[PDB]
Curated annotation (Swiss-Prot), chain A:
Enzymatic reactions: [L-4-(L-arginin-2-N-yl)aspartate](n) + H2O = [L-4-(L-arginin-2-N-yl)aspartate](n-1) + L-4-(L-arginin-2-N-yl)aspartate
Gene: cphB
GO MF terms held by the record: peptidyl-dipeptidase activity; protein homodimerization activity; serine-type peptidase activity
GO biological process, one term: proteolysis
Active site, per annotation: S129, H171, E198
Native source species: Synechocystis sp. (strain ATCC 27184 / PCC 6803 / Kazusa)
Name assigned to this protein: Cyanophycinase
Temperature sensitivity of activity: Optimum temperature is 35 degrees Celsius.
Phenotype for D97A: 2.5-fold decrease in enzyme activity
SUPFAM superfamilies the UniProt entry points to: Class I glutamine amidotransferase-like
Organism domain of life: Bacteria
Length: 266, 265
């Protein structure tokens, strides 16, 4: 209930009503004792988006907030920001563009330390929209809908590697992103795909479980027992086949257990 | 050239190789084919009928008839029913699937088409609306851009040609996976087949399903589903579906219905 976790949020989360997802991040960051850094670097309006979340978390009641306004990679070396990261209890990555966020943050001392403290179980990390997309080592940077799966449908890139064993997609059902996720999985079938809807969150707990929170669904797309794909045989614009996939679509309160590779009801 | 049932995802190629339509032609007897075209799904039946008349005539057939049923009474018409006894294949055009069922379902004419198809005497193809009618349970409409929920899909009664399946069409092109998942949640005993434009799932008499054409067929299987919240939640609430099996197939690949397994070309 206040144990550190990683919250992967599908974008457009509730900022007005119960704010259940944002409240959960707040609680897992220490609640009234939270020291939270907001990274708005995905956005081309960082002050506005940074102020928005600032106001949300300050209204919830925290010990301290800081907007880590990294607009160039050199600020990833900044002593002041790096010191705050040592003191913090939670980090929140806003939406924007995931390629931009990784360009500014990936492999910086600041982000290396955030990732280390997350992996060590010292702090919580949340990311929404672009901030969700960057969670994997392999990242869906873009891509379209309205087509059958094909490798050209999805733009792959390198993320922050917070959760290396997964590939995240976001605004998922809302933007009909299943085909692009399937396209990503065809050539990374060792990775669990997570398609996370708007105002929905996959919360990765320290024990390996993933709890779903919020308004929609999380789709777990598992090609680890795939019996065949034509991916290596066909051109990038040709349709993909994927045989023997396992699909789990979860809603609020349900859990996917990563070690068991199975889902369970509320 | 053994009779088969071709379930076509719409917008099939009518101009180039016409691979799907040529397959129907072949399975209907080729140069000896006697093909009826049912344009009843459409509000322009004469024009769509003529389109397919031209295509199949160009391929070379023995005889064509447009079974222009525009009211349920014509389902009793002896001339059309006589043709159905003589034919070797029937093609159901696109349009609106509710309209097609409203006109054809449980008529003497359609009951005999269904029986001759079941008996292995004639081939059947349907595209777009004509594909949607193939199951007993039919997807009559619905939207995209939402998580699966029962209100996302409009279910109705189809023609029951292949009762153990539920078909969706123009599938990936119109992002219809969520509505198909929504349908399967209501009927998880049914194998869902999501068929892309210019793609076909061809049901063979041996129980296999061969995929033909440009895109994919998605076989969405909830028969081993471990849990769903479907019985507990309202129609507009998000649905969970645990332990689904998904097979996405392309041209030349085969799904075996009995063993529930797909195979490459």
């Amino acid at each position: 209930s206040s144990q550190p976790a990683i919250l992967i949020i599908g974008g457009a989360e509730d900022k007005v009503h119960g704010r259940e997802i944002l409240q959960t991040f707040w609680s897992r960051s220490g609640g009234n004792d939270a020291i939270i850094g907001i990274i708005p670097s995905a956005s081309r309006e960082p002050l506005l988006i940074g102020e928005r979340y600032q106001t949300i978390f300050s209204d919830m009641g925290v010990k301290e907030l800081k907007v880590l306004d990294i607009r160039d990679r050199a600020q990833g070396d900044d002593s002041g920001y790096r010191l705050f990261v040592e003191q913090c209890t939670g980090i929140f990555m806003t939406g924007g563009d995931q390629l931009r966020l990784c360009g500014l943050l990936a492999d910086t001392p600041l982000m290396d330390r955030i990732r280390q403290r997350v992996h060590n179980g010292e702090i919580s990390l949340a990311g929404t929209s672009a901030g969700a997309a960057v969670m994997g080592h392999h990242m869906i940077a873009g891509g379209s809908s309205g087509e059958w799966p094909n490798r050209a449908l999805v733009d792959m890139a390198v993320g922050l590697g917070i959760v290396p064993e997964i590939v995240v997609d976001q605004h998922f059902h809302n933007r009909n992103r299943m085909a692009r996720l399937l396209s990503a999985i065809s050539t990374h079938p060792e990775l669990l795909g997570l398609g996370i809807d708007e105002d929905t969150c996959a919360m990765f707990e320290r024990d390996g479980s993933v709890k779903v929170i919020g308004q929609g669904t999380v789709s777990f797309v598992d090609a680890r027992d795939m019996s065949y794909t034509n991916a290596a045989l066909v051109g990038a614009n040709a349709p993909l086949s994927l045989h023997n996939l396992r699909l789990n679509i979860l809603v609020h309160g349900e859990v996917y257990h990563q070690v068991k590779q199975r889902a369970f009801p509320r």
